[PDB]
Amino acid sequence: RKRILITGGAGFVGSHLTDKLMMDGHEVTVVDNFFTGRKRNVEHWIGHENFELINHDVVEPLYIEVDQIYHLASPASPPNYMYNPIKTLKTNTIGTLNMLGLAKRVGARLLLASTSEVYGDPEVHPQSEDYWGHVNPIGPRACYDEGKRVAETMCYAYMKQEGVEVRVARIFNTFGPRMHMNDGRVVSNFILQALQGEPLTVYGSGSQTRAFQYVSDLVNGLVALMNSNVSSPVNLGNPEEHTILEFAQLIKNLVGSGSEIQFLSEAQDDPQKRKPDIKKAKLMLGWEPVVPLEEGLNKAIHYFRKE
Amino acid sequence: RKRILITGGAGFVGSHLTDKLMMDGHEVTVVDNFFTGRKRNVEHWIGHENFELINHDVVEPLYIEVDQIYHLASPASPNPIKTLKTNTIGTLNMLGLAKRVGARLLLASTSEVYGDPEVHPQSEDYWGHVNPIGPRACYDEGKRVAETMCYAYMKQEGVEVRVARIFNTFGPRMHMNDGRVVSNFILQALQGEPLTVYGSGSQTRAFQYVSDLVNGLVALMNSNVSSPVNLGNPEEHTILEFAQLIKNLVGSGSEIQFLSEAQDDPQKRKPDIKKAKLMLGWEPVVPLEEGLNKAIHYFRKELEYQ
Numbered sequence: 229r230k231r232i233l234i235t236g237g238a239g240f241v242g243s244h245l246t247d248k249l250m251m252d253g254h255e256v257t258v259v260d261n262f263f264t265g266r267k268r269n270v271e272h273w274i275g276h277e278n279f280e281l282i283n284h285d286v287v288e289p290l291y292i293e294v295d296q297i298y299h300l301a302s303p304a305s306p307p308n309y310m311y312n313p314i315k316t317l318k319t320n321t322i323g324t325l326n327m328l329g330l331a332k333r334v335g336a337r338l339l340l341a342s343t344s345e346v347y348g349d350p351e352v353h354p355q356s357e358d359y360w361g362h363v364n365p366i367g368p369r370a371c372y373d374e375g376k377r378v379a380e381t382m383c384y385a386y387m388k389q390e391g392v393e394v395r396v397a398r399i400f401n402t403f404g405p406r407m408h409m410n411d412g413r414v415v416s417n418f419i420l421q422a423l424q425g426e427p428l429t430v431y432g433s434g435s436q437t438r439a440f441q442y443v444s445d446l447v448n449g450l451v452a453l454m455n456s457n458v459s460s461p462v463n464l465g466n467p468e469e470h471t472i473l474e475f476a477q478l479i480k481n482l483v484g485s486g487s488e489i490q491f492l493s494e495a496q497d498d499p500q501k502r503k504p505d506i507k508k509a510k511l512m513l514g515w516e517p518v519v520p521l522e523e524g525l526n527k528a529i530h531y532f533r534k535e
Numbered sequence: 536r537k538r539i540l541i542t543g544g545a546g547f548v549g550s551h552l553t554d555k556l557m558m559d560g561h562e563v564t565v566v567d568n569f570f571t572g573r574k575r576n577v578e579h580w581i582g583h584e585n586f587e588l589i590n591h592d593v594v595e596p597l598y599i600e601v602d603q604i605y606h607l608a609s610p611a612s613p614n615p616i617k618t619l620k621t622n623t624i625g626t627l628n629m630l631g632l633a634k635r636v637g638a639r640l641l642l643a644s645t646s647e648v649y650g651d652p653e654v655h656p657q658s659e660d661y662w663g664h665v666n667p668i669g670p671r672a673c674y675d676e677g678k679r680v681a682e683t684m685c686y687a688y689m690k691q692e693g694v695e696v697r698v699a700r701i702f703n704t705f706g707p708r709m710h711m712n713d714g715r716v717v718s719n720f721i722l723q724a725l726q727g728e729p730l731t732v733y734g735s736g737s738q739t740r741a742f743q744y745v746s747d748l749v750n751g752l753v754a755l756m757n758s759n760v761s762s763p764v765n766l767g768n769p770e771e772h773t774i775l776e777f778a779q780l781i782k783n784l785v786g787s788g789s790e791i792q793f794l795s796e797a798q799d800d801p802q803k804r805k806p807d808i809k810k811a812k813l814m815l816g817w818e819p820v821v822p823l824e825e826g827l828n829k830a831i832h833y834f835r836k837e838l839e840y841q
């Protein structure tokens with residue numbers, strides 16, 4: 229049925245988006261510069277009749293007839309984006325302007341992969357979509373945060389001024405096969421520790437909690453949101469809390485490397501900074517996260533074990 | 536002495552900056568696409584050896600050899616998309632150029648990066664409270680990210696950047712049909728219309744005379760201060776006092792007049808200028824009365840020219 233463009237389609241979330249859309253029957257074109265993505269992520273569809281992979285940086289204009297654009301082209305984990313603030317800004321600015329220009333020209337509906345970071349260090353808990361956020365416009369993260377903030381602004385500008393149809397997802401922390409293992413976040417870190425024999429190290433009693441979302445739940449959110457009539461931003465994330473200890477335990481079992489878990493009773497964890505309200509997504513999209521933590525960790529570990 | 540690019544050189548603040556800098560013997564080039572600027576604003580210099588006017592949009596790359604760029608090319612508030620492009624593409628372009636030719640770049644930012652503030656007054660390490668998707672975001676978010684841009688080109692590429700957070704400014708050449716309280720009162724007084732004050736006229740507005748700002752910009756440009764600096768006037772005056780001052784300076788028989796069922800909006804923001812004091816030795820020095828005077832003379836002249 230639909231002609232669909234995915235920018236960043238060779239990346240973590242984008243490649244799983246591709247899969248789903250390729251299997252629902254659509255004609256998918258992937259645009260990606262391979263700055264962080266990888267051909268292995270989409271290699272299964274090369275050659276297939278309805279797929280096209282284009283090596284292309286979104287800071288360059290694109291002219292293609294499509295019905296829908298999922299705009300995920302953007303550096304995503306902190307080490308990648310903080311190392312190149314300028315490329316990060318150019319991508320979120322010039323690149324969003326370009327994709328919105330295409331969407332306007334060809335009458336595509338455009339969905340933006342924004343981010344809970346537009347909320348900054350929140351002074352409201354949890355964060356709903358009303359919150360304006362508390363964000364340093366010139367810190368070392370600002371290239372991503374302000375970059376994604378103004379990309380949201382561009383969307384509504386084109387919506388208000390040129391009747392572009394726009395969708396805005398504010399994406400919270402997400403995990404699974406093909407994820408990046410360098411956020412030094414708790415799951416990537418425990419998994420690496422276990423996969424190579426190391427002890428899993430748990431601060432204090434492992435009592436701080438973390439809420440992560442499994443990638444296929446995200447991908448369902450995105451598609452649900454794209455095909456809805458809600459044009460204001462929608463948080464997509466999983467607000468279920470698991471203790472850090474529980475992540476150690478699950479990852480230990482599922483890797484099965486007989487790594488030990490060990491406590492540093494004098495050490496400590498930071499409470500998670502952001503926590504998504506997703507009630508608007510339940511109400512307007514009928515969507516919730518349905519993959520249990522253990523199940524997503526397993527599918528993830530399965531990926532990384534054989535890798 | 537210095538070769539100097541001024542984008543938005545032909546607008547209100549820009550043309551006074553041009554004035555001051557020409558008078559100091561620098562080589563001054565103005566770039567401007569005249570969306571809101573006027574040649575009349577710099578005709579006095581057209582011809583002099585040291586001056587060039589170039590008609591150019593900053594969303595288009597530009598190559599010129601200069602030592603300093605004052606990047607003022609932007610609508611001040613108040614085409615939303617063109618505003619976005621201008622503050623994004625435009626700033627990237629000018630920082631690119633500054634990279635290429637080794638120029639120091641001053642960004643004319645705005646108190647709006649603080650949004651609707653939740654601390655008072657606003658000093659430079661306040662992060663602001665800004666709606667990224669509100670009716671005015673394409674100005675507020677565009678100037679915010681313009682800042683992010685300067686800092687990124689500085690941290691990563693060694694570009695020398697300066698960032699001025701400009702607060703409300705008034706004076707000759709300003710956009711008369713502004714919306715603003717001071718504007719309306721000048722226009723109406725000059726015409727013998729009553730000056731109507733909403734409520735009891737006790738909401739305040741703070742205003743900075745243009746030559747104070749221009750001084751601040753130059754001081755800032757030539758300092759070693761790379762992080763943002765508030766340039767504004769913190770002195771409060773009520774709307775009623777504006778009305779009274781303007782009525783008297785104009786002398787015309789306009790009468791003041793309360794409309795007590797009407798309300799004014801409270802003053803939105805108020806600069807803390809400690810940092811400009813300490814690190815530039817700057818502060819506003821033109822008293823309100825004198826400034827209003829110079830502003831009245833201009834609107835009087837300009838009513839008479841258009």
Ligand SMILES: NC(=O)c1ccc[n+]([C@@H]2O[C@H](COP(=O)([O-])OP(=O)(O)OC[C@H]3O[C@@H](n4cnc5c(N)ncnc54)[C@H](O)[C@@H]3O)[C@@H](O)[C@H]2O)c1
Nearest residue numbers: 236239240241261262263264265285286301302304399402
């Ligand atoms: N994974 C998360 O937790 C998370 C959270 C919030 C938001 N997001 C958003 O999701 C989107 C994807 O992130 P991800 O986790 O899949 O990361 P990712 O890095 O794996 O994917 C991003 C993809 O974009 C491509 N890309 C980057 N810049 C580009 C450019 N200029 N032109 C063309 N392609 C370019 C990369 O090569 C990469 O494949 C991002 O836009 C990110 O901001 C992700």
Ligand SMILES: NC(=O)c1ccc[n+]([C@@H]2O[C@H](COP(=O)([O-])OP(=O)(O)OC[C@H]3O[C@@H](n4cnc5c(N)ncnc54)[C@H](O)[C@@H]3O)[C@@H](O)[C@H]2O)c1
Nearest residue numbers: 543546547548568570571572592593608609611645703704
């Ligand atoms: N006047 C104030 O109270 C005040 C307050 C806050 C911020 N500022 C900032 O100070 C700067 C100067 O403002 P101003 O009051 O002189 O306004 P202005 O409109 O008089 O000056 C802007 C000038 O820039 C030019 N310009 C606009 N877009 C351009 C483009 N894309 N390419 C080239 N030139 C372009 C306009 O033609 C005009 O000559 C602006 O950046 C504004 O945001 C001023």
